């Protein structure tokens, strides 16, 4: 249709206004004295929340240009939460800060490209300074402490996570489920997890987590792309009876076929969910087989001349539970016989021997690790269905936090790590004055999180920021107790990874917007 | 319906405004310091791009006259990218420049026709001057260098392309595909390529490339025009089962029949794609047969009395992969027996002997070259499905760039070739003063690309243009390093063919607009 095209300054102010609505709405929740945001609902009572992510999801502006601005930072900010399980709100306020000043510099006539180079240089410097500040979290003692802090001081959760990582390694698969009632349970079962999310939402039957959860599902492994959902009918009808859900793992499920699956499972007849087969090329055909052996299923490939129409329930794999993400699939408790599974592991281990390459070797180790490693299942304690669901949530978060802390350590939270790191880059310079301004723009922005947290407390940002900058190390301002001291000792910290991702992702979208000269959108008509 | 008719000056200003929106939106992306353009989407997050072609595609104006302006240059500019795989943006800014000044001259009372003759004369001169400036790219060493530069300094890609051209000649068919995993692969298989595109989009299942891609497809060769899609049913049903895609190569597939194919393949039942048979007249019937022999299929012609209803899967040809373009079809790895294919080649080679003409001889050689030459298949390396798809893209582009460089060489990029070529035509004159103005209009426009690139860098066009013009040869301004020197040595170049096509296509639409006196469009009512 006819488009409305805006340029330079007009385009920029629109974007600025858009992110201001977004950031302003979200940042009120930041910190221990964060404020409530009321989100309306089509039917029922409004939602009262302090969850920056929830607020962000609801933001959509009437002005198309302003909206594009909001959707952009809204998008990369979420990339942060995906990468470290936290930091979107931080990323969002950081983006507003960089963009606001960056745009001012532009209107003052400074070079957008040099401004961006400066911001980027400052960010790189900052991330290194961040690694330096970082404290390791490698032993179970630390793993437990972090988990406890994440679970809101629940030593139980900390203990659980530490035991779970001790069982499958700190890089092993760990899932959480509702318990059988009072008292937690930790079990390691035959399972696996690969990087492939659902082939479309709608499959999502747990919107709170935006995940797909199937119980006692059959698993169809098809080494091909599915176009005509007719091929499926005979098998789907079989799965229809038996009343069990079905997970389709194919090379791909195309539009119409996928549509059919969504519609039909939504009508109650047959519960299905599909995801692409892991990897590509030859390591794909191999992995597809691993899953088969693990779940006691039979891969259906056209090469050998097999047909889907002739596939019976007996060809299908089986597991007690599968969980699908926006980009992850994890199979829990596969039926596959230990004899076959363990034997399969043996075959892959010889492959590693006959391996005439390091790459080919690393890929084979990855496979056995999955097949041999299993999956740690944490079953959250209980005493009332309500408390049980609430604890399960804290555990899930504590888990993501601990996982990140194990990967890159921790740093002083409450936004002091960022302000501390910036205080050290006071002499960082670029190739020209514009680049220097860019550097100052970024360093100044790194104070946004702390300042906002302080503002929410009803205190004076300038003063607290001034004091925190005056000291060093992990000396900061505890917004909760409203007292200064060592942030780590006071147990107020963030995984170095979450702070890093928040900053890099913010700096990214900010850099893009500052270097935007034209915007195109449909006419409001 | 009732039309709105505009004349002379009114019509002209409308067109000018239209192309100004187009060019202004697109040119911000030009050069290494190009800016981002944000393109909105009906659902999701906006698209942030520096791809002038993507921006151009989204441009549609509300004012019908202004829109016609944009659509016209938008159209011929795209012809450039089609001819050399690059240059649309350049062509677009070149068109804005010629049109802007050209229209000024018109309003000043100068003769439109003479102005156009002058522009054209200057362009012809410039293209010759461009050939002179051109550096050959005939040996594999050069072929590799160019490909490496195109692949963004990836010697691997350069090497691959050079090896591929060494296998099938620099005028031979070369295709790229996803690899089997890590490490590239180069293979020559039985294949062919002719000048016939898809009989309609929709068939396109790879919008990124605007191409149709079928895997392990059957191939129906019918020496007739298809009207009643009923004739097909028996065969389509056969192809329906077997679950394989079908390529229809007929004299033509008419509206309704074509409509049916699109609809049904879009519903998952049977994947089809159709294209016209290559060539015309008698050399058509022959070529149709070559494809048959190459793919092991049987041509179905009415002359011999064959019917489509009685055609079985066994009559259909077969190949591992076919790729259809906006105007090209390439068959990869045909099943045809080497005995039959090689024997067929023999028959054509005797034809060349018994040839009592040079034309008839050239045509026969073309056929054997196709049938005997085969097709070089580059399978892009890997290590993660993402990197693999990204490298495959760089290879595909590097390929187009190298192909063009092999045809007409290379010249100093960064827009300096054009400004250099113009600096030499300072004495070019026409038959009258209007024509002289036309010449100066074109020569002045040839500076648009460089000037725009410099402006995006935040520098002063007048000065850089002034300096580049002051020197000679391939002495230019490296916008990346923002330093002067030899453009070729610094590895900043464009295939002579892309610069030539951009200029000629720009000059074409500009000449047409300058000589437009009346515009007719539907009433906004």
């Amino acid at each position: 249709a006819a488009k409305d095209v805006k340029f330079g300054n007009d385009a920029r102010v629109k974007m600025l206004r858009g992110v201001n609505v977004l950031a302003d709405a979200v940042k009120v929740t930041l910190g221990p004295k964060g404020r409530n945001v009321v989100l309306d609902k089509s039917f029922g009572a409004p939602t009262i929340t302090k969850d920056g992510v929830s607020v962000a999801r609801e933001i959509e502006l009437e002005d198309k240009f302003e909206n594009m601005g909001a959707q952009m930072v809204k998008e990369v900010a979420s990339k942060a939460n995906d990468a470290a399980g936290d930091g979107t709100t931080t990323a969002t306020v950081l983006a507003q800060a960089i963009i606001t000043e960056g745009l001012k510099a532009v209107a003052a006539g400074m070079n957008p490209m040099d401004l961006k180079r400066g911001i980027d240089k400052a960010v790189t410097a900052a991330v290194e300074e961040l690694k330096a500040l970082s404290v390791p979290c490698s032993d179970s003692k630390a793993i437990a402490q972090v988990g406890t802090i994440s679970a809101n001081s629940d030593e139980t959760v900390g203990k659980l996570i530490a035991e779970a990582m001790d069982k499958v390694g700190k890089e092993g698969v760990i899932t959480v489920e509702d318990g059988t009632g009072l008292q937690d349970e930790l079990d390691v079962v035959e399972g696996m997890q690969f990087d492939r999310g659902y082939l479309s939402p709608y499959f999502i039957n747990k919107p709170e987590t935006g995940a797909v959860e199937l119980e006692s599902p059959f698993i169809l492994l098809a080494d091909k792309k599915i176009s005509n959902i007719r091929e499926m009918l005979p098998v789907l009808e079989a799965v229809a009876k038996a009343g069990k859900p079905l997970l389709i793992i194919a090379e791909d499920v195309e539009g119409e076929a996928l549509a059919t699956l969504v519609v039909n499972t939504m009508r109650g007849i047959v519960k299905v969910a599909a995801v692409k087969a892991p990897g590509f090329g030859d390591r794909r055909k191999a992995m597809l087989q691993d899953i088969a052996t693990l779940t006691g299923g039979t891969v259906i490939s056209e090469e050998i001349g097999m047909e889907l129409e002739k596939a019976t329930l007996e060809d299908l794999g089986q597991a007690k539970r599968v969980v699908i993400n926006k980009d992850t699939t994890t199979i829990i408790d596969g039926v596959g016989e230990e004899a076959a599974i363990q034997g399969r592991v043996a075959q892959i281990r010889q492959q590693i021997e006959e391996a005439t390459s390091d790459y080919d070797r690393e890929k084979l180790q990855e496979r056995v690790a999955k097949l041999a490693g299993g999956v740690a299942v944490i079953k959250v304690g209980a005493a009332t269905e309500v408390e049980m669901k609430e604890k399960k949530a804290r555990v899930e978060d504590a888990l993501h936090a601990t996982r990140a802390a194990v990967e890159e350590g921790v740093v002083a939270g409450g936004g002091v790590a960022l302000i501390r790191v910036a205080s050290k880059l006071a002499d960082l310079r670029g190739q020209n004055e514009d680049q220097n301004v860019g550097i100052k723009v970024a360093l100044r922005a790194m104070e946004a999180p702390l300042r906002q947290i302080v503002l929410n407390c009803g205190e004076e940002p300038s003063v607290v920021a001034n004091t925190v900058k005056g000291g060093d190390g992990n000396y900061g301002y505890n917004a909760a107790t409203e007292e200064y001291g060592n942030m780590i000792d006071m147990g107020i910290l963030d995984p170095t990874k979450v702070t890093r991702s928040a900053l890099q992702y913010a700096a990214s979208v900010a850099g893009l917007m500052i270097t935007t000269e034209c915007m195109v959108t449909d006419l409001p008509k | 319906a009732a039309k709105d008719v505009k004349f002379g000056n009114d019509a002209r200003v409308k067109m000018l405004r239209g192309v100004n929106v187009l060019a202004d939106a697109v040119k911000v992306t030009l050069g290494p310091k190009g800016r981002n353009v944000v393109l909105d989407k009906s659902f999701g997050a906006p698209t942030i791009t520096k791809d002038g072609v993507s921006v151009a595609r989204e441009i549609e104006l509300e004012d019908k006259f202004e829109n016609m302006g944009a659509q016209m240059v938008k159209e011929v500019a795209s012809k450039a990218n089609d001819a050399a795989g690059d240059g649309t943006t350049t062509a677009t800014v070149l068109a804005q420049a010629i049109i802007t000044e050209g229209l000024k001259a018109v309003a000043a009372g100068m003769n439109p026709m003479d102005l156009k003759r002058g522009i054209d004369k200057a362009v012809t001169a410039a293209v010759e001057e461009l050939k002179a400036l051109s550096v050959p790219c005939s040996d594999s060493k050069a072929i590799a260098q160019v490909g490496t530069i195109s692949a963004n300094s990836d010697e691997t890609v350069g090497k691959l392309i050079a090896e591929a051209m060494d296998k099938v000649g620099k005028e031979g068919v070369i295709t790229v595909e996803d690899g089997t995993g890590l490490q590239d692969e180069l293979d020559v298989v039985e294949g062919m390529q002719f000048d016939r595109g898809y009989l309609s989009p929709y068939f396109i299942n790879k919008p990124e490339t605007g191409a149709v891609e079928l895997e392990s497809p059957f191939i129906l060769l019918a020496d007739k025009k298809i009207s009643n899609i009923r004739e097909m049913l028996p065969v389509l049903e056969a192809v329906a089962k077997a679950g394989k895609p079908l390529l229809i190569i007929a004299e033509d597939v008419e509206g309704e029949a074509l409509a049916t194919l699109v609809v049904n393949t879009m519903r998952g039942i049977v994947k089809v794609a159709a294209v016209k048979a290559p060539g015309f007249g008698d050399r058509r019937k022959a070529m149709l047969q070559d494809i048959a022999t190459l793919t092991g299929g049987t041509v179905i012609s009415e002359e011999i009395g064959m019917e489509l209803e009685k055609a079985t899967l066994e009559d259909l040809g077969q190949a591992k992969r076919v790729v259809i373009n906006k105007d090209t079809t390439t068959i990869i790895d045909g099943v045809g027996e080497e005995a039959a294919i090689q024997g067929r080649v023999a028959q054509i080679r005797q034809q060349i002997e018994e040839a009592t003409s040079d034309y008839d001889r050239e045509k026969l050689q073309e056929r054997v070259a196709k049938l005997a030459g085969g097709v070089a298949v580059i399978k892009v390396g890997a290590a993660t499905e993402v990197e693999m798809k990204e490298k495959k893209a760089r290879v595909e582009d590097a390929l187009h760039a190298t192909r063009a460089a092999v045809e007409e060489g290379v010249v100093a990029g960064g827009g300096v070739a054009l400004i250099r070529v113009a600096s030499k035509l300072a004495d070019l004159r026409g038959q009258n003063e209007d024509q002289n103005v036309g010449i100066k209009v074109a020569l002045r426009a040839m500076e648009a690309p460089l000037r725009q690139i410099v402006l995006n860098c935040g520098e002063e066009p007048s000065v850089v243009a002034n300096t580049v013009k002051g020197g000679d040869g391939n002495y230019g301004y490296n916008a990346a390093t923002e330093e002067y020197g030899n453009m070729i040595d610094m590895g900043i170049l464009d295939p002579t063919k892309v610069t030539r096509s951009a200029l000629q296509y720009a000059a074409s639409v500009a000449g047409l607009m300058i000589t437009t006196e009346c515009m007719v469009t539907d009433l906004p009512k």
């Binding site: 009918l233 789907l236 009808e237 229809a240 059919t260 519609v263 007849i269 | -």
Partner: peptide, 12 residues
């Protein structure tokens, strides 16, 4: 446009 199997599956 679509059809329904005896068991209720809606499909093209």
């Amino acid at each position: 446009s679509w059809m329904t199997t005896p068991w209720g599956f809606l499909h093209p």
